[PDB]
Symmetry: C2
Subunit: 181 residues, 2 copies
Protein backbone atom coordinates (compact mmCIF):
# COMPACT_ATOMS: atom_id res chain seq x y z
CA UNK A 1 0.00 0.00 0.00
CA UNK A 2 1.12 3.55 -0.70
CA UNK A 3 0.35 6.62 1.33
CA UNK A 4 1.26 10.31 0.99
CA UNK A 5 4.94 11.01 1.57
CA UNK A 6 4.02 13.50 4.32
CA UNK A 7 2.35 10.76 6.39
CA UNK A 8 5.30 9.14 8.17
CA UNK A 9 5.52 6.23 10.65
CA UNK A 10 6.16 6.98 14.27
CA UNK A 11 5.66 10.06 16.43
CA UNK A 12 6.62 13.67 16.00
CA UNK A 13 10.29 14.34 16.88
CA UNK A 14 11.46 15.96 20.09
CA UNK A 15 12.60 19.34 18.85
CA UNK A 16 14.03 21.53 21.70
CA UNK A 17 11.30 24.10 21.77
CA UNK A 18 12.01 25.81 25.18
CA UNK A 19 15.43 26.96 24.13
CA UNK A 20 14.17 28.17 20.76
CA UNK A 21 11.25 29.88 22.39
CA UNK A 22 13.46 31.74 24.83
CA UNK A 23 15.87 32.79 22.04
CA UNK A 24 13.04 34.04 19.90
CA UNK A 25 10.80 35.94 22.35
CA UNK A 26 13.15 38.97 22.54
CA UNK A 27 13.47 39.11 18.77
CA UNK A 28 9.91 39.26 17.46
CA UNK A 29 10.38 42.63 15.80
CA UNK A 30 13.40 41.29 13.97
CA UNK A 31 11.26 38.44 12.59
CA UNK A 32 8.72 40.87 11.15
CA UNK A 33 8.77 42.16 7.59
CA UNK A 34 8.77 40.21 4.34
CA UNK A 35 9.76 36.57 3.99
CA UNK A 36 9.67 34.61 0.73
CA UNK A 37 9.01 30.86 0.76
CA UNK A 38 12.13 29.37 -0.82
CA UNK A 39 11.12 25.71 -0.56
CA UNK A 40 8.68 23.45 1.30
CA UNK A 41 7.89 19.78 1.78
CA UNK A 42 4.62 18.49 0.26
CA UNK A 43 1.83 20.48 1.89
CA UNK A 44 -1.82 19.88 0.88
CA UNK A 45 -2.96 22.97 2.83
CA UNK A 46 -0.88 25.74 1.17
CA UNK A 47 -3.18 27.40 -1.33
CA UNK A 48 -0.48 29.63 -2.79
CA UNK A 49 1.64 27.78 -5.31
CA UNK A 50 4.05 30.34 -6.70
CA UNK A 51 5.69 33.65 -5.69
CA UNK A 52 4.81 33.04 -2.04
CA UNK A 53 5.44 36.26 -0.15
CA UNK A 54 4.64 36.47 3.57
CA UNK A 55 4.45 39.96 5.05
CA UNK A 56 4.50 39.98 8.84
CA UNK A 57 3.52 42.91 11.15
CA UNK A 58 4.20 42.57 14.85
CA UNK A 59 1.81 44.41 17.14
CA UNK A 60 3.60 43.51 20.37
CA UNK A 61 1.53 40.37 21.05
CA UNK A 62 1.21 38.57 17.72
CA UNK A 63 1.99 38.82 14.04
CA UNK A 64 -0.54 39.78 11.47
CA UNK A 65 0.29 38.14 8.15
CA UNK A 66 -0.54 38.94 4.56
CA UNK A 67 0.48 35.96 2.42
CA UNK A 68 0.31 36.50 -1.33
CA UNK A 69 1.32 34.85 -4.60
CA UNK A 70 -0.22 32.83 -7.44
CA UNK A 71 -2.84 30.20 -6.54
CA UNK A 72 -3.00 26.75 -8.15
CA UNK A 73 -5.59 28.03 -10.64
CA UNK A 74 -3.27 30.77 -11.81
CA UNK A 75 -4.95 33.74 -10.10
CA UNK A 76 -3.40 36.16 -7.67
CA UNK A 77 -4.33 35.29 -4.08
CA UNK A 78 -4.05 36.96 -0.71
CA UNK A 79 -4.50 35.05 2.51
CA UNK A 80 -4.85 36.69 5.95
CA UNK A 81 -2.97 34.95 8.72
CA UNK A 82 -1.87 35.34 12.32
CA UNK A 83 1.00 33.96 14.36
CA UNK A 84 0.35 34.01 18.12
CA UNK A 85 1.57 32.06 21.16
CA UNK A 86 0.06 28.62 21.58
CA UNK A 87 -3.08 29.12 23.70
CA UNK A 88 -2.15 26.47 26.28
CA UNK A 89 1.17 28.17 27.03
CA UNK A 90 3.25 25.65 25.03
CA UNK A 91 6.62 27.01 23.85
CA UNK A 92 5.66 27.53 20.27
CA UNK A 93 3.53 29.71 18.07
CA UNK A 94 0.24 28.83 16.40
CA UNK A 95 -0.01 29.77 12.74
CA UNK A 96 -3.64 30.48 11.82
CA UNK A 97 -5.27 31.53 8.54
CA UNK A 98 -8.75 32.67 7.61
CA UNK A 99 -11.00 29.78 6.66
CA UNK A 100 -8.36 27.25 7.76
CA UNK A 101 -7.06 25.08 10.62
CA UNK A 102 -4.35 26.47 12.96
CA UNK A 103 -1.15 24.54 13.61
CA UNK A 104 1.98 24.64 15.68
CA UNK A 105 4.87 26.42 14.01
CA UNK A 106 8.37 26.07 15.35
CA UNK A 107 11.23 28.25 14.17
CA UNK A 108 13.92 25.59 14.18
CA UNK A 109 16.63 28.09 13.23
CA UNK A 110 16.83 31.65 11.94
CA UNK A 111 19.37 34.45 11.59
CA UNK A 112 16.51 36.99 11.07
CA UNK A 113 18.31 38.76 8.21
CA UNK A 114 18.74 35.95 5.63
CA UNK A 115 16.83 32.75 6.40
CA UNK A 116 14.41 30.86 8.56
CA UNK A 117 13.82 27.11 8.87
CA UNK A 118 10.21 26.36 9.94
CA UNK A 119 8.59 23.16 11.12
CA UNK A 120 5.09 21.91 11.98
CA UNK A 121 4.14 18.37 13.07
CA UNK A 122 0.94 16.56 14.00
CA UNK A 123 0.56 13.16 15.59
CA UNK A 124 -2.25 10.91 14.43
CA UNK A 125 -4.06 8.22 16.43
CA UNK A 126 -2.72 5.38 14.22
CA UNK A 127 1.03 5.46 14.83
CA UNK A 128 2.03 8.03 12.22
CA UNK A 129 2.63 11.77 12.05
CA UNK A 130 2.58 14.39 9.40
CA UNK A 131 5.13 17.14 9.25
CA UNK A 132 5.48 20.20 7.14
CA UNK A 133 8.78 22.03 6.69
CA UNK A 134 9.67 25.34 5.07
CA UNK A 135 12.75 27.32 4.14
CA UNK A 136 12.16 31.07 4.18
CA UNK A 137 14.43 33.76 2.71
CA UNK A 138 14.58 37.52 2.98
CA UNK A 139 15.02 37.58 -0.81
CA UNK A 140 13.68 35.75 -3.81
CA UNK A 141 16.88 33.71 -3.89
CA UNK A 142 18.73 31.98 -1.07
CA UNK A 143 22.42 31.19 -1.12
CA UNK A 144 23.48 27.57 -0.64
CA UNK A 145 25.26 28.42 2.61
CA UNK A 146 21.93 29.25 4.19
CA UNK A 147 20.03 26.42 2.52
CA UNK A 148 22.60 24.03 4.01
CA UNK A 149 21.98 25.48 7.46
CA UNK A 150 18.35 24.53 7.15
CA UNK A 151 19.26 21.12 5.69
CA UNK A 152 21.37 20.46 8.77
CA UNK A 153 18.60 21.58 11.09
CA UNK A 154 16.02 19.35 9.49
CA UNK A 155 18.36 16.36 9.31
CA UNK A 156 19.00 16.86 12.99
CA UNK A 157 15.30 16.16 13.70
CA UNK A 158 15.15 13.28 11.33
CA UNK A 159 13.36 15.02 8.52
CA UNK A 160 14.15 13.61 4.99
CA UNK A 161 15.37 16.73 3.28
CA UNK A 162 14.93 15.14 -0.12
CA UNK A 163 11.25 16.02 0.52
CA UNK A 164 11.88 19.72 -0.18
CA UNK A 165 10.59 21.26 -3.40
CA UNK A 166 11.68 24.76 -4.51
CA UNK A 167 8.97 27.41 -4.93
CA UNK A 168 8.83 29.68 -7.94
CA UNK A 169 10.25 33.09 -7.05
CA UNK A 170 12.02 36.05 -8.68
CA UNK A 171 11.65 38.44 -11.53
CA UNK A 172 8.63 36.61 -13.05
CA UNK A 173 6.62 37.24 -9.87
CA UNK A 174 4.34 40.30 -9.66
CA UNK A 175 5.44 41.20 -6.14
CA UNK A 176 4.56 44.88 -6.40
CA UNK A 177 1.01 43.87 -7.35
CA UNK A 178 0.87 41.23 -4.62
CA UNK A 179 1.82 43.74 -1.96
CA UNK A 180 -1.28 45.85 -2.85
CA UNK A 181 -3.86 43.04 -2.68
Amino acid sequence: DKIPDFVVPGKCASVDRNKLWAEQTPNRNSYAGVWYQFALTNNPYQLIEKCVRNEYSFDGKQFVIESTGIAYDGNLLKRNGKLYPNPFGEPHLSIDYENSFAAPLVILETDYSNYACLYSCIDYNFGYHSDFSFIFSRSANLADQYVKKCEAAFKNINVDTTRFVKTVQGSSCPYDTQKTL
Copy 2:
Protein backbone atom coordinates in the same frame (compact mmCIF):
# COMPACT_ATOMS: atom_id res chain seq x y z
CA LYS B 1 -7.55 4.47 -3.19
CA ILE B 2 -7.64 7.27 -0.50
CA PRO B 3 -9.15 7.66 2.93
CA ASP B 4 -12.91 7.89 3.26
CA PHE B 5 -12.50 11.29 4.96
CA VAL B 6 -10.74 12.84 1.90
CA VAL B 7 -13.78 13.79 -0.29
CA PRO B 8 -14.00 15.58 -3.64
CA GLY B 9 -14.91 19.22 -3.83
CA LYS B 10 -14.85 22.23 -1.57
CA CYS B 11 -16.04 22.26 2.01
CA ALA B 12 -19.75 22.84 2.20
CA SER B 13 -21.36 26.20 2.75
CA VAL B 14 -23.09 25.68 6.14
CA ASP B 15 -25.07 28.78 7.15
CA ARG B 16 -22.74 29.70 9.97
CA ASN B 17 -24.19 33.16 10.65
CA LYS B 18 -27.68 31.87 11.40
CA LEU B 19 -26.11 29.26 13.70
CA TRP B 20 -23.85 31.75 15.45
CA ALA B 21 -26.79 34.08 16.08
CA GLU B 22 -28.76 31.24 17.61
CA GLN B 23 -25.88 29.87 19.68
CA THR B 24 -23.96 32.85 20.99
CA PRO B 25 -26.53 33.74 23.72
CA ASN B 26 -26.84 30.05 24.74
CA ARG B 27 -23.19 29.21 25.41
CA ASN B 28 -23.91 28.69 29.02
CA SER B 29 -26.41 25.94 28.11
CA TYR B 30 -23.80 24.11 26.05
CA ALA B 31 -21.54 23.63 29.12
CA GLY B 32 -21.45 20.47 31.14
CA VAL B 33 -20.81 16.91 30.07
CA TRP B 34 -21.23 15.59 26.53
CA TYR B 35 -20.58 12.01 25.49
CA GLN B 36 -19.41 11.22 21.96
CA PHE B 37 -22.15 8.98 20.58
CA ALA B 38 -20.74 8.56 17.08
CA LEU B 39 -18.19 10.13 14.71
CA THR B 40 -16.90 9.88 11.16
CA ASN B 41 -13.35 8.55 10.66
CA ASN B 42 -11.05 10.85 12.52
CA PRO B 43 -7.25 10.41 12.57
CA TYR B 44 -6.80 13.10 15.23
CA GLN B 45 -9.01 11.83 18.05
CA LEU B 46 -6.75 10.04 20.54
CA ILE B 47 -9.63 8.74 22.69
CA GLU B 48 -11.23 5.61 21.20
CA LYS B 49 -13.86 4.56 23.75
CA CYS B 50 -15.99 6.00 26.53
CA VAL B 51 -15.38 9.51 25.23
CA ARG B 52 -16.60 12.02 27.84
CA ASN B 53 -16.15 15.73 27.24
CA GLU B 54 -16.66 18.13 30.15
CA TYR B 55 -17.10 21.75 29.13
CA SER B 56 -16.78 24.79 31.38
CA PHE B 57 -17.84 28.23 30.02
CA ASP B 58 -16.00 31.31 31.28
CA GLY B 59 -17.99 34.04 29.50
CA LYS B 60 -15.79 34.05 26.39
CA GLN B 61 -14.57 30.46 25.76
CA PHE B 62 -14.95 26.87 26.95
CA VAL B 63 -12.35 24.84 28.74
CA ILE B 64 -12.63 21.15 28.01
CA GLU B 65 -11.57 18.03 29.85
CA SER B 66 -11.90 15.02 27.56
CA THR B 67 -11.46 11.54 28.97
CA GLY B 68 -11.91 7.92 28.01
CA ILE B 69 -9.94 4.90 26.83
CA ALA B 70 -7.08 5.49 24.39
CA TYR B 71 -6.37 3.22 21.43
CA ASP B 72 -3.88 1.26 23.57
CA GLY B 73 -6.56 0.43 26.15
CA ASN B 74 -5.28 2.86 28.77
CA LEU B 75 -7.22 5.76 30.33
CA LEU B 76 -6.44 9.14 28.81
CA LYS B 77 -7.21 12.76 29.63
CA ARG B 78 -6.87 15.53 27.01
CA ASN B 79 -7.15 19.25 27.69
CA GLY B 80 -8.99 21.36 25.18
CA LYS B 81 -10.42 24.77 24.52
CA LEU B 82 -13.28 26.04 22.34
CA TYR B 83 -13.06 29.78 21.57
CA PRO B 84 -14.32 32.17 18.87
CA ASN B 85 -12.40 32.01 15.63
CA PRO B 86 -9.56 34.58 16.00
CA PHE B 87 -10.33 36.27 12.68
CA GLY B 88 -13.90 37.07 13.84
CA GLU B 89 -15.42 34.30 11.63
CA PRO B 90 -18.83 33.04 12.80
CA HIS B 91 -17.58 29.75 14.25
CA LEU B 92 -15.54 28.39 17.11
CA SER B 93 -12.03 27.00 17.06
CA ILE B 94 -11.51 23.67 18.85
CA ASP B 95 -7.96 23.44 20.16
CA TYR B 96 -6.22 20.71 22.14
CA GLU B 97 -2.86 20.47 23.89
CA ASN B 98 -0.09 19.29 21.54
CA SER B 99 -2.43 19.26 18.50
CA PHE B 100 -3.75 21.45 15.69
CA ALA B 101 -6.84 23.69 16.12
CA ALA B 102 -9.78 23.42 13.76
CA PRO B 103 -13.08 25.14 13.04
CA LEU B 104 -16.00 23.60 14.84
CA VAL B 105 -19.56 24.33 13.82
CA ILE B 106 -22.57 23.25 15.86
CA LEU B 107 -24.90 22.31 13.01
CA GLU B 108 -27.76 21.63 15.43
CA THR B 109 -28.27 21.22 19.16
CA ASP B 110 -31.11 21.23 21.69
CA TYR B 111 -28.66 21.64 24.61
CA SER B 112 -30.50 19.05 26.75
CA ASN B 113 -30.07 15.90 24.69
CA TYR B 114 -27.89 16.15 21.57
CA ALA B 115 -25.47 18.16 19.49
CA CYS B 116 -24.38 17.64 15.86
CA LEU B 117 -20.80 18.91 15.33
CA TYR B 118 -18.87 19.57 12.14
CA SER B 119 -15.38 20.53 11.04
CA CYS B 120 -13.97 20.83 7.52
CA ILE B 121 -10.66 21.64 5.87
CA ASP B 122 -9.91 22.37 2.23
CA TYR B 123 -6.92 21.00 0.34
CA ASN B 124 -5.03 22.68 -2.47
CA PHE B 125 -5.87 19.83 -4.86
CA GLY B 126 -9.58 20.55 -4.74
CA TYR B 127 -10.76 17.98 -2.18
CA HIS B 128 -11.69 18.49 1.46
CA SER B 129 -11.77 16.54 4.64
CA ASP B 130 -14.58 16.84 7.09
CA PHE B 131 -15.03 15.44 10.49
CA SER B 132 -18.47 15.04 12.07
CA PHE B 133 -19.67 14.04 15.53
CA ILE B 134 -22.91 13.23 17.31
CA PHE B 135 -22.83 14.21 20.99
CA SER B 136 -25.35 13.15 23.66
CA ARG B 137 -25.95 14.28 27.21
CA SER B 138 -26.18 10.57 28.07
CA ALA B 139 -24.35 7.35 27.21
CA ASN B 140 -27.21 6.40 24.92
CA LEU B 141 -29.02 8.70 22.53
CA ALA B 142 -32.67 8.27 21.50
CA ASP B 143 -33.25 7.44 17.86
CA GLN B 144 -35.20 10.61 17.28
CA TYR B 145 -32.14 12.68 18.10
CA VAL B 146 -29.81 10.49 16.04
CA LYS B 147 -32.18 11.08 13.14
CA LYS B 148 -32.10 14.84 13.71
CA CYS B 149 -28.33 14.83 13.38
CA GLU B 150 -28.51 12.59 10.30
CA ALA B 151 -30.88 15.09 8.64
CA ALA B 152 -28.67 18.04 9.56
CA PHE B 153 -25.58 16.37 8.06
CA LYS B 154 -27.47 15.28 4.94
CA ASN B 155 -28.56 18.88 4.47
CA ILE B 156 -24.92 19.88 4.03
CA ASN B 157 -24.09 16.88 1.85
CA VAL B 158 -22.08 14.98 4.45
CA ASP B 159 -22.50 11.23 3.83
CA THR B 160 -24.02 10.03 7.06
CA THR B 161 -23.16 6.41 6.32
CA ARG B 162 -19.67 7.48 7.46
CA PHE B 163 -20.76 7.59 11.12
CA VAL B 164 -19.46 4.86 13.42
CA LYS B 165 -20.83 4.43 16.95
CA THR B 166 -18.46 5.03 19.90
CA VAL B 167 -18.35 2.58 22.78
CA GLN B 168 -20.31 4.03 25.70
CA GLY B 169 -22.18 2.71 28.74
CA SER B 170 -21.64 -0.06 31.33
CA SER B 171 -18.35 -1.17 29.95
CA CYS B 172 -16.97 2.40 30.70
CA PRO B 173 -15.10 3.60 33.80
CA TYR B 174 -16.62 7.07 33.93
CA ASP B 175 -16.20 7.55 37.69
CA THR B 176 -12.45 6.94 37.33
CA GLN B 177 -12.42 9.20 34.29
CA LYS B 178 -14.05 12.07 36.30
CA THR B 179 -11.04 11.87 38.60
CA LEU B 180 -8.32 12.29 35.99
